[PDB]
Every structure is written in C-alpha cells, then in structure tokens.
From Swiss-Prot:
Assembly mode: Interacts with TGFBR1; prevents TGFBR1 phosphorylation by TGFBR2 and stabilizes it in the inactive conformation. Interacts with ACVR1B and SMAD7. Identified in a complex composed of RYR1, PDE4D, PKA, FKBP1A and protein phosphatase 1 (PP1). Interacts directly with RYR2 and RYR3. Interacts with GLMN; rapamycin and FK506 abolish the interaction with GLMN in a dose dependent manner. Interacts directly with RYR1.
Protein known as: Peptidyl-prolyl cis-trans isomerase FKBP1A
UniProt GO cellular component terms: cytoplasm; cytoplasmic side of membrane; cytosol; membrane; ryanodine receptor complex; sarcoplasmic reticulum; sarcoplasmic reticulum membrane; terminal cisterna
Record organism: Homo sapiens
One of the GO BP terms on file: regulation of amyloid precursor protein catabolic process
Amino acid sequence: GVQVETISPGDGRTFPKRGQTCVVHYTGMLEDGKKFDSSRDRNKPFKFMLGKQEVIRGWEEGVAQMSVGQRAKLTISPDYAYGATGHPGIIPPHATLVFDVELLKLE
Ligand SMILES: [N+]
C-alpha cells in the first residue's frame, strides 16, 4: 500500500474527489534517494484526473488523503507502482518508490 507523511499541512478540509483534476508538483526517488523524475525541474505542474487510472495506484490512493496546499512524502510499494516488471531503463523490478508531492489546487 501507500504510506503518507505530512511535510507541510494543507487546509485540512478540501480533499480530492473522483473526477476532479489534481494539479501537483512532485519528485520521484528510488529507495536509495536517487531522483528519477520531477515536475519541479521542468518548472511545470503535472495534472491528472482522480479515478481515470492515468497514474499509478499509489498516487490515486495517497493523493486522495491529502488536502489542498498539503505537501507530503508518499512511500509506495511495488504492487501500487510498477510491479515485478518495473519499467526497464528507468524503474527497477520490485521497486518501492518515494514521492515528494505537493497538492497545489483542484480543477
Ligand atoms: N510495470
């Protein structure tokens, strides 16, 4: 499953619902602490609709427990990320990923 640890609190009341577009900034890291992706480096926030399975299971379940403005660290197990196959060249098999995600707003 996913484990959420608050880094900085959000409003404590606006949680994302199915069908909404979440606008976030993130940084992906492998268990070692090595970065592999980051909307921050691209200086452009990422958007995805909750429920449309366009991101890994772990983001859909973890981000749904965050509120607007909150910045959290998600620790996601293989079964909720890229599985046994991973994504060769980028993500190793059976990899536990750590994301530093900040929920900027909802649309
Ligand atoms: N995968």
